[PDB]
Amino acid sequence: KDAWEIPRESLRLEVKLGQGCFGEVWMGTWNGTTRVAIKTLKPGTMSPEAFLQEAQVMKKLRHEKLVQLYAVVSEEPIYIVTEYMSKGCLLDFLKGEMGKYLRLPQLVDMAAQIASGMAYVERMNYVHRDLRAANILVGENLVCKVADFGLFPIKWTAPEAALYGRFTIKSDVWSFGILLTELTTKGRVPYPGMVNREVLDQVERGYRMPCPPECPESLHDLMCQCWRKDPEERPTFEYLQAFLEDYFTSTEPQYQPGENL
């Protein structure tokens, strides 16, 4: 019964963006004037409280690289209202029409922003648990924001988290290393050709994805640093953030555009 509550008629659900078993997300209009994302609860498929656990967690987390909760409707039909991201999934953005044109300079910049959102998460002592391109939202002028659609994603999960449930900001960092992979193969599923079991067995015995085609060793190496066996050997988001922002001067300042990267 908060100050996030809004009269219902002040929402116009226009285009359907996704459907799950728990509800739907629509694009729409709030207060006649402003573009929004509207999460839905399909009644009966979970409690009112356990659906509004999302809004409570987003209420304590504000930053320009995290998707912002705007408003809620706290009685059936229930709604969670966020800012609108005109480009959708980073994943879909990488794979579709805008893929051909992305270059390492754009992809590293997208990466820096995720890093920046995740550095906020680091500082608030929170853990994402599902960092991967599917959970990053893209906006105009390539803005990227950390989000969560709510969905096991083993190809992206640090092994101590997949096996023992030791989920931390450092198992998040490993996922980041995986995300760096989707940014640089424009969206391709990591560990191509391998099923989950093949992955677990192999990363466990030290296998790590090679340098993607046309991507500098110095970024592949940043990947490898994220994928160190021991969780505490992995770098922070603050470090990852500063390494990515600075990349084209400090690390690869002799970078020349190629055919894909």
Ligand X SMILES: CC(C)(C)c1cc(NC(=O)Nc2ccccc2)n(-c2cccc(N)c2)n1
Which residues are catalytic, by number?
130
Q: What are the phi and psi torsion angles at 102 (to 5°)?
A: -50, 140
The smaller minimum CB distance to ligand X, of residues 143 and 200, is found at 143
- The annotation status of 211 as a binding-site residue, yes or no, is no
Per CB under 6 A, the segment of 53-61, 157-165, 200-208, 241-249 that binds ligand X is 53-61
- The annotation status of 18 as a binding-site residue, yes or no, is yes
CA–CA separation, 149 and 113 (whole Å):
19
Provide the β-strand partners of residue 145.
137
CA–CA distances in Å: residue 216 to residues 149, 177, 248:
32, 15, 11
Angle between helices 169-184 and 217-226 (to 10 degrees): 150
Residue selected from 61, 194, 200, 224 as contacting ligand X according to rule CB under 6 A: 61
> What binding mask, one character per residue, do residues 111-140 give for ligand X by CB under 6 A, x or -?
-----------------------x--x---
- The annotation status of 23 as a binding-site residue, yes or no, is yes
Per CB under 6 A, the segment of 148-156, 167-175, 205-213, 219-227 that binds ligand X is 148-156
222 binds ligand X per the rule CB under 6 A? no
CA angle in degrees (0–180, nearest 5) for 88-64-158: 70
Residue selected from 148, 178, 182, 240 as contacting ligand X according to rule CB under 6 A: 148
Q: Are 117 and 239 in contact, with CB atoms under 8 Å apart?
A: no
Per CB under 6 A, the segment of 59-67, 108-116, 168-176, 180-188 that binds ligand X is 59-67
Residue selected from 8, 12, 18, 221 as contacting ligand X according to rule CB under 6 A: 18
CA angle in degrees (0–180, nearest 5) for 186-189-192: 115
Please, what is the minimum distance in Å from the beta carbon of residue 69 to ligand X? 7
Q: Which tokens in the block code for residue 259?
A: 């055919």
The smaller minimum CB distance to ligand X, of residues 87 and 228, is found at 87
Per CB under 6 A, the segment of 58-66, 160-168, 171-179, 253-261 that binds ligand X is 58-66
145: left (phi over 0), alpha (psi -120 to 50) or beta: beta
Q: Are 240 and 131 in contact, with CB atoms under 8 Å apart?
A: no
- The annotation status of 258 as a binding-site residue, yes or no, is no
CA 87 to chain centre: 14
66 binds ligand X per the rule CB under 6 A? yes
The smaller minimum CB distance to ligand X, of residues 37 and 115, is found at 37
Please, what is the minimum distance in Å from the beta carbon of residue 71 to ligand X? 12
122 contact partners, CB below 8 Å, separation of at least 6: 169, 236, 237, 238
Q: Residue ranges for the binding site for ATP?
A: 17-25, 39
Residues lying near ligand X in the complex (CB under 6 A): 17-20, 24-25, 37, 39, 53-54, 57-58, 61, 66-67, 80, 82, 84-85, 88-89, 91-92, 134, 137, 146-150
